[PDB]
Enzyme design. Sequence first.
Site, PDB file in Angstrom:
ATOM      1  N   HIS A 178       0.875  -1.303   0.008  1.00  0.00           N
ATOM      2  CA  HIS A 178      -0.093   0.120   0.006  1.00  0.00           C
ATOM      3  C   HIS A 178       0.694   1.344  -0.097  1.00  0.00           C
ATOM      4  O   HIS A 178       0.288   2.377  -0.155  1.00  0.00           O
ATOM      5  CB  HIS A 178      -1.000  -0.044   1.212  1.00  0.00           C
ATOM      6  CG  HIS A 178      -0.538   0.555   2.540  1.00  0.00           C
ATOM      7  ND1 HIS A 178      -0.160  -0.257   3.670  1.00  0.00           N
ATOM      8  CD2 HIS A 178      -0.221   1.604   3.129  1.00  0.00           C
ATOM      9  CE1 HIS A 178       0.060   0.351   4.573  1.00  0.00           C
ATOM     10  NE2 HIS A 178       0.140   1.456   4.644  1.00  0.00           N
ATOM     11  N   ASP A 191      -0.038  -7.701   2.090  1.00  0.00           N
ATOM     12  CA  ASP A 191       0.563  -6.092   2.047  1.00  0.00           C
ATOM     13  C   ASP A 191       2.301  -6.074   2.017  1.00  0.00           C
ATOM     14  O   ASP A 191       2.868  -5.836   3.011  1.00  0.00           O
ATOM     15  CB  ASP A 191       0.148  -5.462   3.118  1.00  0.00           C
ATOM     16  CG  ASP A 191       0.107  -3.927   2.824  1.00  0.00           C
ATOM     17  OD1 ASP A 191       0.629  -3.569   1.909  1.00  0.00           O
ATOM     18  OD2 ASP A 191       0.103  -3.339   4.133  1.00  0.00           O
ATOM     19  N   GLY A 232       2.969   6.488   8.543  1.00  0.00           N
ATOM     20  CA  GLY A 232       4.439   7.047   8.212  1.00  0.00           C
ATOM     21  C   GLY A 232       5.585   5.910   8.383  1.00  0.00           C
ATOM     22  O   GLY A 232       6.533   5.976   8.031  1.00  0.00           O
ATOM     23  N   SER A 254       4.484   2.690   8.186  1.00  0.00           N
ATOM     24  CA  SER A 254       4.205   1.646   6.985  1.00  0.00           C
ATOM     25  C   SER A 254       5.210   1.225   6.068  1.00  0.00           C
ATOM     26  O   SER A 254       6.013   2.280   5.813  1.00  0.00           O
ATOM     27  CB  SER A 254       2.904   2.332   6.080  1.00  0.00           C
ATOM     28  OG  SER A 254       1.702   2.203   6.864  1.00  0.00           O
ATOM     29  N   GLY A 255       5.348   0.007   5.936  1.00  0.00           N
ATOM     30  CA  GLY A 255       6.267  -0.567   4.956  1.00  0.00           C
ATOM     31  C   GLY A 255       7.808  -0.902   5.861  1.00  0.00           C
ATOM     32  O   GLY A 255       8.370  -1.539   5.376  1.00  0.00           O
TER      33      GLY A 255
HETATM   34  N1  LIG Z   1      -1.621   1.427  14.519  1.00  0.00           N
HETATM   35  C1  LIG Z   1      -0.964   0.850  13.903  1.00  0.00           C
HETATM   36  N2  LIG Z   1       0.094  -0.041  14.305  1.00  0.00           N
HETATM   37  C2  LIG Z   1      -0.724   1.206  12.416  1.00  0.00           C
HETATM   38  C3  LIG Z   1       0.450   0.936  11.627  1.00  0.00           C
HETATM   39  C4  LIG Z   1       0.529   1.281  10.244  1.00  0.00           C
HETATM   40  C5  LIG Z   1      -0.203   2.432   9.992  1.00  0.00           C
HETATM   41  N3  LIG Z   1      -0.317   2.847   8.721  1.00  0.00           N
HETATM   42  C6  LIG Z   1      -1.327   3.737   8.747  1.00  0.00           C
HETATM   43  C7  LIG Z   1      -1.722   4.448   7.837  1.00  0.00           C
HETATM   44  C8  LIG Z   1      -2.687   5.404   7.973  1.00  0.00           C
HETATM   45  C9  LIG Z   1      -3.157   6.158   6.719  1.00  0.00           C
HETATM   46  C10 LIG Z   1      -2.599   6.051   5.612  1.00  0.00           C
HETATM   47  C11 LIG Z   1      -1.420   5.172   5.313  1.00  0.00           C
HETATM   48  C12 LIG Z   1      -0.704   5.151   4.190  1.00  0.00           C
HETATM   49  C13 LIG Z   1      -1.696   5.173   2.913  1.00  0.00           C
HETATM   50  C14 LIG Z   1      -1.006   5.024   1.660  1.00  0.00           C
HETATM   51  C15 LIG Z   1       0.533   5.282   1.590  1.00  0.00           C
HETATM   52  C16 LIG Z   1       1.185   5.378   2.856  1.00  0.00           C
HETATM   53  C17 LIG Z   1       0.473   5.494   3.908  1.00  0.00           C
HETATM   54  C18 LIG Z   1      -1.230   4.445   6.449  1.00  0.00           C
HETATM   55  O1  LIG Z   1      -0.270   3.473   6.198  1.00  0.00           O
HETATM   56  N4  LIG Z   1      -1.996   3.671   9.877  1.00  0.00           N
HETATM   57  C19 LIG Z   1      -1.361   2.796  10.533  1.00  0.00           C
HETATM   58  C20 LIG Z   1      -1.526   2.217  11.866  1.00  0.00           C
END
Ligand SMILES: NC(=[NH2+])c1ccc2[nH]c(-c3cccc(-c4ccccc4)c3[O-])nc2c1
Length: 223
Positions: A40, A84, A175, A177-178
């Site tokens: 994603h 993912d 932020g 993520s990945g």
């Molecule tokens: N609670 C958690 N451990 C968590 C972990 C990863 C996440 N990643 C996100 C997230 C939220 C909104 C947008 C993106 C996003 C969407 C597209 C590209 C990059 C980031 C997220 O990864 N929320 C997150 C919450």
Amino acid sequence: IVGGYTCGANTVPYQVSLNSGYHFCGGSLINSQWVVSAAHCYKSGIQVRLGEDNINVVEGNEQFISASKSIVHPSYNSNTLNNDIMLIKLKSAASLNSRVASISLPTSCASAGTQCLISGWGNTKSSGTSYPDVLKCLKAPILSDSSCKSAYPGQITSNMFCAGYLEGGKDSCQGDSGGPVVCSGKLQGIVSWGSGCAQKNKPGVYTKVCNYVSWIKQTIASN
Ligand SMILES: NC(=[NH2+])c1ccc2[nH]c(-c3cccc(-c4ccccc4)c3[O-])nc2c1
Ligand SMILES: [Ca+2]
Ligand SMILES: [Cl-]
């Protein structure tokens, strides 16, 4: 990372920042020409930034390399976030040293209770937006499958696992993520999703890397 601590410059040498004019996702260097991140986080115009600590200051040790291709898992489902994972091939190989190094892929999956290190430049507030300049770290344990499924009924597939604290306060966030979830020196997870950040009884969900090792190997070997 919410409730984590400052890692210290270059103490997580396999951590990369995916940049398109700003930091939008993390990733892990697994060899000198390939990075693993989350599907994603895919977009075109990705520049991979290695050897970073402060992402807003060039302090030295940084290597900025453009991605030559990004390979999103063919069965990635954006609605469930099942599968993912994405591989990014770099335009040129990175120079590995003590500040930039790859992390090993696992040979077996990890067990509940395993303590892991999660890092990234994602949001540090659960209620609000505060993005840090330097890399943050969090030590978190992998939870049992029953606790994970009890927290997210009907949303956990066999390609995901939960890690974190049910009391809330410490978690990965947007932020991050990945990025990497490293346990005993092996990359076991990729930061994927969660409900909010650091909320009680809503741990983070990670892509279970041990389920993709042959896929990663075969894909790298043919590209
Ligand atoms: N609670 C958690 N451990 C968590 C972990 C990863 C996440 N990643 C996100 C997230 C939220 C909104 C947008 C993106 C996003 C969407 C597209 C590209 C990059 C980031 C997220 O990864 N929320 C997150 C919450
Ligand atoms: Ca920098
Ligand atoms: Cl279920």
